[PDB]
Ligand binder design. Structure first.
Ligand SMILES: CCCCCC/C=C/CCCCCCCC(=O)OC[C@H](COP(=O)([O-])OCC[N+](C)(C)C)OC(=O)CCCCCCCCCCCCCCCCC
Ligand SMILES: CCCCCC/C=C/CCCCCCCC(=O)OC[C@H](COP(=O)([O-])OCC[N+](C)(C)C)OC(=O)CCCCCCCCCCCCCCCCC
Lengths: 277, 286
């Protein structure tokens, strides 16, 4: 039911995003010891890159229907949603860790190990929620055909609907849990971004990135929740909107992190070349 | 329908909270010229207290069941909650923004008219956003109390089962759209509020600085809304539990916000008056 043109355009856009991610990864691994790259925590950026590539992979997974090879659509939905959750956690953990380190250094002066441990605790919370969701009730797909008589007290209407969807029995409770924990994380991240407001340059100050990212995350998540809930008879629209939202959010966050590093690196190297001659 | 004991307990707690709000209003109006109250924003504190009164009133209205007209009751209890939350939280964001702009001035001071208009827009524009969303919800997709009898013949990969359920619930046809919208707008404004609280983290004292109240409020609001959405959706066969949880969440949030706003004002007011009395008696004795 998915048009080949939409699939091709979405695949090309996600591939370009993945190539940008790989370019940033190569830049931050090769130029680790440089001052501009080193002062921006190159080790904590690797986790953000991995989260971004995981999110792009989930966006790829959102575009396939039916089965892979006689497989279960339930497993596909579960794995792509859990991949998206883990990817967003890994994207947003390191940024908050960097902001917290900047705040603590500014105020009565933290190694990378403690920040990685906090990020690991965040990931453990997400993993616990995903595991209890999967074990308590899977996302089993059901064929619902039924006839219902509606009585509003003034008129009677009968409808016959044959609906098929893949969902949990109590899906809104897991939605509330995941969205709520993420939202508490985003509230504390906005607090941290405000605390480190105008404290350093954008390469070291990850405060505009947080404020752009949280707003994009909330907007995209709300739009896609509503669209998936109601416009389920529009597979092309749902697929395009989901992939576009994931791509836009991930690419915007990564660009906001890494464009300052690249331009400052270029300026520093050009200044060194001018001085040497 | 609802047990009289739970109704009595909830009514007592809501009335006590309302009396606390009235006492704070009386303190704000009477001691409006005091230095401790004046260095706060008493005119904005009034708006916060009216929002608190609206939230407590909606908490009262949540207890009426099987009496009314029921569609209008749900619509007006929910609109009252939305407007009360907007009126409670807008003033605090305005105070934080004013404290941030005062202590980050530069040569381009802009114009005082523009500053006052921005302060008014961090409150009235939010209230108008909620107003237009509620008007769109009411006019487009109003709550309808409808009873459905239905027989469902579901089938899994290998198992076939049949169910016959009849339910009486009140909701909109596209209720989750309006939920996502109101939750979304409130969440964006509360994210900006958390940003403002962080920006003014250690800029003044708790009576003037409002970062702790903002953070506690946004966290408690997210927790309460997340819990109450879920329990209202799923535990609809538990009227006493739903009513008690909704009233408790509203009461806890409103009381915590107002206590965080006003208890430090009372503490520093008492300290200031005690200092004044001590110096007065020392001067009179000599
Ligand atoms: C930085 C990059 C990351 C940002 C990407 C944002 C894009 C999100 C799009 C995916 C979310 C919509 C899909 C919802 C689930 C679905 O498809 O239905 C299957 C079902 C729900 O089905 P349903 O209810 O949508 O449709 C069936 C309707 N019915 C009437 C039958 C109920 O999923 C679940 O049961 C819940 C699973 C929860 C797992 C977590 C989901 C992934 C989390 C990713 C976002 C978290 C971070 C941001 C949160 C916002 C800020 C606080
Ligand atoms: C400062 C103190 C104030 C904070 C108090 C927080 C408490 C909130 C409790 C009320 C919310 C639960 C009730 C949900 C609606 C309902 O009753 O069902 C009727 C219906 C939905 O019914 P339903 O879907 O839940 O049940 C039917 C299930 N069914 C399967 C059929 C769909 O409501 C609506 O149609 C939506 C109306 C939206 C209006 C706004 C709601 C009140 C807003 C108050 C919170 C806003 C501020 C916080 C936002 C979050 C933080 C960013």
């Amino acid at each position: 039911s998915l048009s080949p043109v939409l699939l091709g355009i979405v695949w090309t856009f996600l591939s370009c995003g993945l190539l940008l991610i790989l370019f940033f990864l190569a830049f931050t691994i090769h130029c680790r010891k440089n001052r501009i790259v080193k002062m921006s925590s190159p080790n904590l950026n690797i986790v953000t890159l991995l989260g971004s590539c995981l999110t792009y992979s989930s966006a790829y997974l959102f575009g396939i229907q039916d089965v892979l090879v006689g497989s279960s659509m339930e497993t596909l939905i579960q794995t792509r949603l859990s991949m998206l959750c883990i990817g967003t956690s890994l994207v947003f953990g390191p940024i908050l860790g960097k902001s917290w380190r900047l705040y603590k250094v500014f105020t009565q002066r933290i190694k990378d190990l403690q920040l990685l441990g906090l990020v690991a605790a965040l990931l453990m919370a997400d993993v616990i929620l995903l595991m209890t969701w999967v074990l308590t009730d899977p996302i089993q797909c059901l064929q619902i055909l039924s006839v219902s008589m509606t009585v509003t007290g003034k008129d009677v209407s009968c409808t016959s609907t044959s609906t098929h969807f893949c969902a949990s029995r109590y899906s809104d409770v897991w939605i509330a849990l995941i969205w709520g924990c993420k939202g508490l994380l985003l509230l504390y991240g906005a607090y941290l971004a405000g605390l480190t407001g105008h404290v350093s340059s954008p390469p070291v100050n990850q405060s505009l990135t947080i404020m752009v990212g949280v707003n994009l995350l909330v907007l995209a998540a709300g739009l896609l929740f509503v669209v998936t809930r109601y416009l389920h008879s529009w597979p092309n629209l749902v697929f395009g909107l989901t992939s576009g939202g994931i791509f836009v959010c991930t690419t915007t966050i990564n660009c906001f992190i890494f464009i300052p590093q690249l331009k400052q690196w270029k300026a520093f190297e050009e200044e060194n070349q001018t001085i040497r001659r």
